[PDB]
Amino acid sequence: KRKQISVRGLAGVENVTELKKNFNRHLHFTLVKDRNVATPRDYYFALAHTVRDHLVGRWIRTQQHYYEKDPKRIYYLSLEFYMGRTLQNTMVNLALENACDEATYQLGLDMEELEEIEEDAGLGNGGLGRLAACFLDSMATLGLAAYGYGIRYEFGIFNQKICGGWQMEEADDWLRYGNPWEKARPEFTLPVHFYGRVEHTSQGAKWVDTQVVLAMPYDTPVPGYRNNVVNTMRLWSAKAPNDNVGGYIQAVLDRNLAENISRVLYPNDNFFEGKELRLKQEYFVVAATLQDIIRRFKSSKNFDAFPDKVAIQLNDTHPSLAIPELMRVLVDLERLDWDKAWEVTVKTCAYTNHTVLPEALERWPVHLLETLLPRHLQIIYEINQRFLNRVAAAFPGDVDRLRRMSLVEEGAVKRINMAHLCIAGSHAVNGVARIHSEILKKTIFKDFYELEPHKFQNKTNGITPRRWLVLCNPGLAEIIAERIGEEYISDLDQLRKLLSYVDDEAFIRDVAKVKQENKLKFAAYLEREYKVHINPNSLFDVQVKRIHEYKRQLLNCLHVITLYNRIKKEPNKFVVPRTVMIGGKAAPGYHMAKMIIKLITAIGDVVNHDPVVGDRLRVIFLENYRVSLAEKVIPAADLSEQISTAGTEASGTGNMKFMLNGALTIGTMDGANVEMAEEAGEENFFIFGMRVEDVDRLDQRGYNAQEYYDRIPELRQIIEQLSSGFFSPKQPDLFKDIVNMLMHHDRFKVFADYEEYVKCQERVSALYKNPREWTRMVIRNIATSGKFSSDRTIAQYAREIWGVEPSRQRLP
Ligand SMILES: O=C(Nc1ccccn1)C(=O)N[C@@H]1O[C@H](CO)[C@@H](O)[C@H](O)[C@H]1O
């Protein structure tokens, strides 16, 4: 069955023979193992090396091709690359999946069992990091000379353990058994400088007396979809510089301090912590990367041509130091005059904003910058003076606008606003969904928009249909290919052809069949890995994303308790059985998010053990939500929970994954949800709740949660259950902080959307009772998910910002 899937390619007889041969070669020469001692892990690694060999020729040829053609080079700078696993992706993109599947089968091995051995490269927190990963895939698929640049964290996002119903954090030791995908490049190691002081002298400024940390690059291949393109992700690793008993020994041990720079990912989602170590990581990436950029530019054939040959894309403000660093290099080292260097810098750099919440913005204390990067602070100040001079010329006498626009923020602690730096130093600034990009121009960066309107753009997010359809849901990819062929895989708009099958009995049957297959497989996963049983004949109601108050997992909690309370009130009344699944990691220092996880498990402790409820309702917390788990649960989902307060989710991308994979969406008019509903037709989406206009109206008069409590008996009941200790009998006051926040300090207006949410959820159950109509609406969703391919997104970046033309053209 497995092998009959045509989108997975051909199992050529000579290819299968060669693969088996090389599998065995690696087991022997690479792993130094025999079939007598060899474990499943050994067999995974033998396959990984075998598959990896197939990238090499294309990888060398692609990079040679870019040297010869000399196209404009795109440098995508990010502190996060949420790559997930690599084995299946490589096989898919090289058309090797069926061949390896046959090869391993003939050797007596189940390739899917082998795939489960691979650790995620979890070098990101969530959506922003995953966007970077989808972007790398799409840029390679679109034949762009693009280079992902970041940091090789020794430890990615922490592994989440649930113990006693609480999140526990453990180190994500992803490199324990090695990483067969990366190629260490110690020969290309570069120096990065910290601290020191500035000397203004004969030639000008000089950054001296610095402490050096070496940046060692590790290069990872990024294969395009069956176009023979293999691009590169370069990730820098921190290495101590080359040059008494206790004294000598301690000096050697103290090398760890420098090397700590690339030790661990800061696990924050939509929140800025001004840690010096984070600032070092950010500069580490920027300094080493820009050295590569300058050197490669010089090896291509005076800096007037720089922006024609270089694009630097800033993934949020995290690599914003690229702006003053480029100025520093061009002025201090290359000896260009300020004006020309600045012209070059702005044309080279572009900035992507992912944020709404004020506390998410990077605002570094000037004292920290003065100490760590004294020359960069000097340059920032000069940038600010000339930029504010431009504001003053454009808007004479508008003093508050000057204050609002300044890169320098006054207060008890004087800070540099890095978003302001990015806008000033970039020729393009984009948000990540239409609603978000509009609000950047409307309110958040209104004054910047008024000064330079041409700067502001939209680039609605997307996801790769390779990982997010072909890999994770081959069954759905196949039934689609059976009707419309395979072109849609890198031309997702072709999914619109599926609207011709809304009344096709065979397709309706097959869409529902695939979903049920995915649900059985996920149920099997939970039983195998956690001994957790879920009802396969229940609606799979899924909210998976990082735990944050704005994403309103708490609103989901209120609904779950509503369903429970309604069953208890009328036990004889039929309800559509549900398995409510919530998963996601909380930032270790975010108390409320940690309490919310505990509430989910505590709700489950009551609901899942009430005999009156039985298998009619179950609430489970999915442990350790990560890219590999997303690939499992999303194809199994019936209902996608996308319930952020309107105006808070910049775009979302998990929403797109669900839409592509045959789940229907319950959601607010927020982020990309708006455009998803536009594409499919609002009649095909479960839209509920306040619009942004309604939220703003509430803000204008003041949000009083008490009013909702007083007017809604069912909500009142739930709050009193939480307060009295119904969900924490051994510790009655456990959830007092949650109750207090909801009643008095709720920034995200949970109570305000409660009634519409519950009513909307009733309509979900009503449609689910009609399998034919559920499935027909699903078809209308899958068929219109095309816009949300990251190929579309990247094509827009290329044409509208980078000035390069994408190409699906194959290499020899
Ligand atoms: O801002 C983010 N992380 C962050 C912030 C500060 C410090 C560290 N990390 C983030 O993940 N933003 C997300 O970017 C996604 C891709 O565009 C959007 O789809 C999603 O709406 C948005 O919340």
DSSP conformation letters of 59-96: HHHHHHHHHHH-PPEEEEE-S-EEEE--HHHHHHHTT-
Q: Give, in order, the Cα–Cα distances in Å from 456 to each of 350, 353, 360.
A: 10, 11, 20
> Taking every pair of C-alpha atoms in the chain, what is the biggest distance, in angstroms?
90
**Cα distance between residue 119 and residue 106, in whole Å:** 25
Q: List, edge to edge, every strand of the sheet that includes 415-417.
A: 363-365, 415-417, 408-409
C-alpha of 61 from chain center: 30
Cα 127 to ligand 1 centre (Å): 6
Tell me, yes or no, whether 117 and 235 share the same domain: yes
Render 236-252 in DSSP notation, one character per residue.
Answer: EEEE-----HHHHHHHH
- Residue whose pair of structure tokens reads 């640049």 in the numeric block: 149
Residue 568 known to be catalytic: no
Identify whether the C-beta of residue 281 lies closer than 8 Å to the C-beta of residue 261: yes
With residues binned 3-state (H G I as helix, E B as strand, rest as coil), the percentages for the chain, rounded to 5, are: 55, 15, 30
Tell me, yes or no, whether 502 and 456 share the same domain: no
Q: How many beta carbons lie within 10 A of that of residue 93, not counting itself?
A: 27
**Cα distance between residue 428 and residue 346, in whole Å:** 9
Query: Strand locations in 152-277, DSSP E?
Result: 159-163, 166-170, 183-184, 190-194, 197-200, 205-208, 211-223, 230-239
Judge whether 390 is annotated as a binding position.
Answer: no
| Ligand 1 atom nearest to 270, measured from its CA | 5
Tell me, yes or no, whether 784 and 805 share the same domain: no
- Residue whose pair of structure tokens reads 């909801």 in the numeric block: 742
Helix (H, G, I), strand (E, B) or coil at 810: coil
Tell me which method was used to determine the 3D structure: X-ray
Domain count, the chain: 2
Identify whether the C-beta of residue 125 lies closer than 8 Å to the C-beta of residue 157: yes
Q: Which two tokens stand for residue 208?
A: 């001296």
Query: What number of residues does the chain have?
Result: 812
Judge whether 67 is annotated as a binding position.
Answer: yes
Give the torsion sign (CA, 447, 449, 453, 454).
positive
Tell me, yes or no, whether 708 and 794 share the same domain: no
Angle at CA of residue 357, ends 354 and 361, nearest 5°: 65
Tell me, yes or no, whether 387 and 276 share the same domain: yes
Identify whether the C-beta of residue 806 lies closer than 8 Å to the C-beta of residue 799: yes
Give the torsion sign (CA, 72, 73, 78, 83).
positive
Tell me, yes or no, whether 456 and 468 share the same domain: no
β-pair partners for 238: 215
β-pair partners for 159: 170
Which residue ranges have their beta carbon within 6 Å of ligand 1?
125-128, 131, 268-272, 354-355, 360, 432, 461, 649-653, 671
Render 624-675 in DSSP notation, one character per residue.
Answer: T--HHHHHHHGGG-SEEEE-PPTT--S--SHHHHHHHTT-EEEE-S-TTHHH
Cα 649 to ligand 1 centre (Å): 9
Identify whether the C-beta of residue 355 lies closer than 8 Å to the C-beta of residue 439: no
Tell me, yes or no, whether 171 and 256 share the same domain: yes
Identify whether the C-beta of residue 12 lies closer than 8 Å to the C-beta of residue 485: no
Identify whether the C-beta of residue 359 lies closer than 8 Å to the C-beta of residue 590: no
143: domain CATH number? Answer: 3.40.50.2000
- Resolution as reported, in Å: 1.9
Q: What 8-state DSSP symbol labels residue 443? A: I
If one residue of 314, 354, 434, 463 were mutated to test the ligand 1 pocket, choosing by the most ligand atoms within 8 A of its CB, it would be 354
Query: 37-41: which pairs have CB atoms within 8 A and are 24 or more residues apart?
Result: 40/113, 40/114, 40/117, 41/117, 41/177
Tell me, yes or no, whether 750 and 795 share the same domain: no
- Rounded to 10 degrees, the C-alpha dihedral 178/182/187/189 comes to -90
Q: Containing domain of residue 17, as a range?
A: 1-462+790-812
Judge whether 296 is annotated as a binding position.
Answer: yes
Q: What 8-state DSSP symbol labels residue 142? A: T
Helix (H, G, I), strand (E, B) or coil at 789: strand
Q: Which two tokens stand for residue 580?
A: 């409510």
Residue 546 known to be catalytic: yes
**Cα distance between residue 278 and residue 299, in whole Å:** 32
Among 316, 322, 375, which residue's Cα sits nearest to residue 348?
Answer: 322
Q: Nearest residue CA, atom 9 of ligand 1?
A: 269
Q: How many CA atoms lie within 13 A of 477 on its CB side?
A: 25
Judge whether 787 is annotated as a binding position.
Answer: no
For the chain, breaks with the C atom over 2.5 A from the next N come after 243, 301
Query: 651-654: which pairs have CB atoms within 8 A and are 24 or more residues apart?
Result: 651/127, 651/354, 651/431, 651/432, 651/433, 651/436, 651/460, 651/461, 652/127, 652/433, 652/461, 652/545, 653/127, 653/130, 653/131, 653/134, 653/461, 653/462, 653/463, 654/127, 654/544, 654/545, 654/630
Tell me, yes or no, whether 400 and 532 share the same domain: no
**Cα distance between residue 76 and residue 315, in whole Å:** 7
Collect all residues with Cβ–Cβ distance below 8 Å to 631 and sequence separation of at least 6. 84, 467, 468, 471, 472
Helix (H, G, I), strand (E, B) or coil at 427: coil
State the catalytic residue, choosing from 278, 309, 466, 545. Answer: 545
Residue 354 known to be catalytic: yes
Tell me, yes or no, whether 457 and 501 share the same domain: no
Cα 95 to ligand 1 centre (Å): 33
Identify whether the C-beta of residue 372 lies closer than 8 Å to the C-beta of residue 284: no
Helix (H, G, I), strand (E, B) or coil at 398: coil
- Rounded to 10 degrees, the C-alpha dihedral 466/468/471/476 comes to -100
Tell me, yes or no, whether 413 and 444 share the same domain: yes
Residue 653 known to be catalytic: yes
Tell me, yes or no, whether 360 and 470 share the same domain: no
**Cα distance between residue 763 and residue 378, in whole Å:** 59
